[PDB]
Amino acid sequence: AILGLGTDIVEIARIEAVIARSGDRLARRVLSDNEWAIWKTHHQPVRFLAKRFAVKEAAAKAFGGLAFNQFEVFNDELGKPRLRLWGEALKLAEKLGVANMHVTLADERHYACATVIIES
Amino acid sequence: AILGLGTDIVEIARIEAVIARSGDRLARRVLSDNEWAIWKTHHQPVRFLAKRFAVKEAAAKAFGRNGLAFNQFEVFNDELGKPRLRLWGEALKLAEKLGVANMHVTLADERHYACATVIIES
Amino acid sequence: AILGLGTDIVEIARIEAVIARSGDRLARRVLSDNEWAIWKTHHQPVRFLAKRFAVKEAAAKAFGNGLAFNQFEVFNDELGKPRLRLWGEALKLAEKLGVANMHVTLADERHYACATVIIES
Amino acid sequence: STIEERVKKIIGEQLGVKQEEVTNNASFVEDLGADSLDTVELVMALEEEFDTEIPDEEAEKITTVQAAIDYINGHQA
Amino acid sequence: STIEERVKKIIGEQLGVKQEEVTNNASFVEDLGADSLDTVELVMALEEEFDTEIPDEEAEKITTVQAAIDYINGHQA
Amino acid sequence: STIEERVKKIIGEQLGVKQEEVTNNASFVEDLGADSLDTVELVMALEEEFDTEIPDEEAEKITTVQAAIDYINGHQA
């Protein structure tokens, strides 16, 4: 049974403009500690940040209680993105009865897009 | 358990051009009576019409053909701000025929694009 | 019982640039034999190729070896609704995961195409 | 003008395609390269010109220019 | 200035909307046309101006100009 | 020239990256900023230059410049 569905689209150059205006505050608000540590040394932090932002926003809508600082994205051994929850995010997931989380991500030269489905 | 799947993407400025050419005509085809009443007085009718069009297109694709009409199903927001579908007439009869138990909708909008996805499941 | 989920977006003008640089190479790799035959006489092969590419990439991500885009084939059924036909190692993997149903949706605009695929048992 | 000429004029204008390409057999999607939106714009522009309303899923089956001319001739009052 | 004036000025700046349009009752999304980002930029702009941090989904519920003025007055130190 | 130089030249050309940035250790996605497309264009450009065909999911596992050089050296006939 599908418990929730979320999608997002992100214009990358727009993210780059935001970084130009406010420096690292965007990444500080959206990324967990681990993801921030990775972001500090990335070759193309704009693209990384865009992709993470798309995935996490898609997840937030799918849950529709979820804080960007309580759940991080990681790639498993197959290269497929996967969600990791802790704190009140994980508490919410256990409350809703989430058994499986499905994430997909695509990005182009100008846009990143992600979709998340949470299911029991 | 998924009975159908649909997605859509809408370029907002493109909607702006269409309205510039044909006025209220698009809104009169895509929106139900209630939604049209809302559209007539909306502050940014371009964005409202774009998102509603996206959602309804996704729903129509999810239902996949005898007939599914934009004028028999409208979109509304529940208490959480989450979009939801309301069917009547032959749209509702179709939902009952296919055995639709749950409908899942998600909607997003950017400055230039609004995308929506609908899954119908038994 | 969702087994996998995949999405993709394709900038059409970018595909046009690729075809401009390499002729028939891209379509020759991504498309199956049937799809190649359709491409050869298609009026607007750029748009056809972009749409097929979107569907195929979405499918590849939904599945998550030796899986080739030419082992995923798209066709339209009697309703105009897209549907997937698998050959070879794609079909083998599908039988392995226990896939019972495949759901596809595709949309295209003047500048972008986008596809989403769900595989479920 | 004739109904054929006016319909072809509107199709060409809406789709951004040259007149000579607008043949009667041409499909809007498969021959003229219209996208999902472009269906709306063309169908509804023709509905404006000839003062007739067609059901949405009925317009979805109008895939060719000749089918549009046919519907207009059949229903224009 | 007042908190109202500074907040309204920042909202107008971030959203690209004229000051007269920024009424206290106005909703950011439904009335001022914020897309999904403008929440981000506006929230963090007000957090910067008034040196306060709001939880994402908490500021998320803030849907109107008056609600932003209210939170700033209630929490600014 | 050498296989390394030609591979790095093609990588730079396809990805729009300066030669000095194209190190042997560099990852196409994680270090050179390639997208779900630049994989396609780069893979096929190398397939044309060295007249060899690689299975798709094998090319997906070739993530670095050095891995591409290695495969080319291993399979070119």
UniProtKB/Swiss-Prot annotation, chain B:
Q: What class of enzyme is it?
A: transferase
Catalytic reaction annotation: apo-[ACP] + CoA = holo-[ACP] + adenosine 3',5'-bisphosphate + H(+)
Q: Name one Pfam family in it.
A: ACPS
Gene Ontology terms, cellular component aspect?
cytoplasm
Q: For this protein, what is the EC number?
A: 2.7.8.7
Residues annotated to bind Mg(2+): D8, E57
- What are the entry keywords? Cytoplasm, Fatty acid biosynthesis, Fatty acid metabolism, Lipid biosynthesis, Lipid metabolism, Magnesium, Metal-binding, Transferase
Cofactor(s) it depends on: Mg(2+)
Q: What is one process in the GO biological process aspect for this record?
A: fatty acid biosynthetic process
Compartments (UniProt record): Cytoplasm
Question: Which top-rank group of organisms is this from?
Answer: Bacteria
Task: Report the main location listed first in the record.
Answer: cytoplasm
What SUPFAM superfamilies is this protein classified in?
Answer: 4'-phosphopantetheinyl transferase (SSF56214)
Q: State any single GO MF term.
A: holo-[acyl-carrier-protein] synthase activity
Protein family per UniProt:
Belongs to the P-Pant transferase superfamily. AcpS family.
**Subunit structure comment from the entry:** Homodimer.
Function text? Transfers the 4'-phosphopantetheine moiety from coenzyme A to the 'Ser-36' of acyl-carrier-protein.
Q: What is this protein called?
A: Holo-[acyl-carrier-protein] synthase
- Taxon lineage: Bacteria, Pseudomonadati, Pseudomonadota, Gammaproteobacteria, Enterobacterales
Its gene name is: acpS
From Swiss-Prot, chains D, E, F:
Domain Carrier per the UniProt entry, residue ranges: 1-76
For this entry, list what GO says about its biological process.
lipid A biosynthetic process
Mind telling me how this protein is modified after translation?
4'-phosphopantetheine is transferred from CoA to a specific serine of apo-ACP by AcpS. This modification is essential for activity because fatty acids are bound in thioester linkage to the sulfhydryl of the prosthetic group.
Q: Where in the cell is it found?
A: Cytoplasm
Protein keywords:
Cytoplasm, Fatty acid biosynthesis, Fatty acid metabolism, Lipid biosynthesis, Lipid metabolism, Phosphopantetheine, Phosphoprotein
Task: Tell me which GO cellular component terms the UniProt record holds.
Answer: cytosol; membrane
Pathway(s) the chain acts in = Lipid metabolism; fatty acid biosynthesis
The record's section on PANTHER family has: ACYL CARRIER PROTEIN (PTHR20863), CARRIER DOMAIN-CONTAINING PROTEIN (PTHR20863:SF76)
Q: Which family does it belong to?
A: Belongs to the acyl carrier protein (ACP) family.
Give the protein name, as stated in the record. Acyl carrier protein
Gene source species: Escherichia coli O45:K1 (strain S88 / ExPEC)
